[PDB]
Amino acid sequence: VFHKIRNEDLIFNESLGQGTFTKIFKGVRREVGDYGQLHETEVLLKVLDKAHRNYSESFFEAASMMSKLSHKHLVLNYGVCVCGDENILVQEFVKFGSLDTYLKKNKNCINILWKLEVAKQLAAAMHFLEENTLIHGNVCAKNILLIREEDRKTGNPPFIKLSDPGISITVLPKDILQERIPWVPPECIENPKNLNLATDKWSFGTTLWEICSGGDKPLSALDSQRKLQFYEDRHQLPAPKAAELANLINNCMDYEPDHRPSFRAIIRDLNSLF
Ligand SMILES: CC(C)CCN1c2nc(Nc3cc(F)c(O)c(F)c3)ncc2N(C)C(=O)C1C
Known part of the structure; x- marks a missing residue:
């Protein structure tokens, strides 16, 4: 399904706008990149609304759609943030x-x-x-x-x-x-x-x-x-x-x-x- 990105590797910053039943932020990710290098990577963080966690399955299936295919004109998925009962998608900024x-x-x-x-x-x-x-x-x-x-x-x-x-x-x-x-x-x-x-x-x-x-x-x-x-x-x-x-x-x-x-x-x- 999705790669798990843990709580501590992600920093939530500015709110960029909204999707359908979601809040969207600019974020920063600490990661190990190519050659073991440590990277400060800008990411996008889509947070499904607390009131609308009903749609949790459809929230992730749409991202599990661009994830199972690879093309230069499709936004890259980085994974899912693990924290609380929340649903966070981590995507290319x-x-x-x-x-x-x-x-x-x-x-x-x-x-x-x-x-x-x-x-x-x-x-x-x-x-x-x-x-x-x-x-x-x-x-x-x-x-x-x-x-x-x-x-x-x-x-x-x-x-x-x-x-x-x-x-x-x-x-x-x-x-x-x-x-x-x-x-x-x-x-x-x-x-x-x-x-x-x-x-x-x-x-x-x-x-x-x-x-x-x-x-x-x-x-x-x-x-x-x-x-x-x-x-x-x-x-x-x-x-x-x-x-x-x-x-x-x-x-x-x-x-x-x-x-x-x-x-x-x-x-x-x-x-x-x-
Ligand atoms: C809520 C809207 C606006 C977010 C739009 N959006 C993205 N936006 C940006 N960069 C961005 C840069 C800005 F200078 C800015 O003011 C801003 F709002 C967003 N990166 C990745 C995405 N990805 C992956 C997305 O799926 C979507 C939907």
């Missing part, structure tokens, strides 16, 4: 934070080519999961970490990684799922048991909309019931001003799950864009 908050703060000078490079790296990660038939279940700009910024000095592209999906939507209450529209596909709003490989194709289109919207959350002005109304009326997200990917967003966000393109074809269509 990324300096530049979420793509969600990065697209927002850098919306002014992120051009189409920057969005395209991040879009390909995300599709490449999803293509890797599709070939392994591994359902992620929570693709969004918040679960994406920016490891390297774009270097305009040498034209070096940015680099991203995809973190774990957190507690599965097949287990979360209905108020959270309806709040996650339009990231959760319409067939999962009807029934969370429809979680499938086609779910990640829909959520990829929503993330692709976030990337072209400069941090904007789709359907922010709509509440839960008007998001449920959004799906029943079979509406689609508005075309972003940076519209060179609205056709791919709408094609991925297909109300018929069996018609959403495979991430194979998504990459071809992405690569055929100047």
Whole structure:
């Protein structure tokens, strides 16, 4: 399952934000690295809420998903912290934070080519999961970490990684799922048991909309019931001003799950864009 990291090797520091029923901190880990060297390693510490330890199993299965596979675009898991009755996941710390908050703060000078490079790296990660038939279940700009910024000095592209999906939507209450529209596909709003490989194709289109919207959350002005109304009326997200990917967003966000393109074809269509 997971490697056990003991209490004394970890130091909890600043709170970075929240996940679903979790608190997230920047931490420091003392470890023996390569060649027996002692390392002070920055880590991420996801602490499942004391009130929500019900979801302890789903909390660790999502991390036991990125752990049993290895890929350059997947966030590394370090293990589980042993202390009290708490549930702590120890994961790779990324300096530049979420793509969600990065697209927002850098919306002014992120051009189409920057969005395209991040879009390909995300599709490449999803293509890797599709070939392994591994359902992620929570693709969004918040679960994406920016490891390297774009270097305009040498034209070096940015680099991203995809973190774990957190507690599965097949287990979360209905108020959270309806709040996650339009990231959760319409067939999962009807029934969370429809979680499938086609779910990640829909959520990829929503993330692709976030990337072209400069941090904007789709359907922010709509509440839960008007998001449920959004799906029943079979509406689609508005075309972003940076519209060179609205056709791919709408094609991925297909109300018929069996018609959403495979991430194979998504990459071809992405690569055929100047
Ligand atoms: C709650 C949100 C925001 C945490 C996002 N997040 C991560 N963030 C960071 N670095 C980070 C850097 C910052 F300068 C910062 O202000 C910040 F908040 C976070 N490293 C690893 C992750 N890993 C693995 C994750 O799964 C997730 C979800």
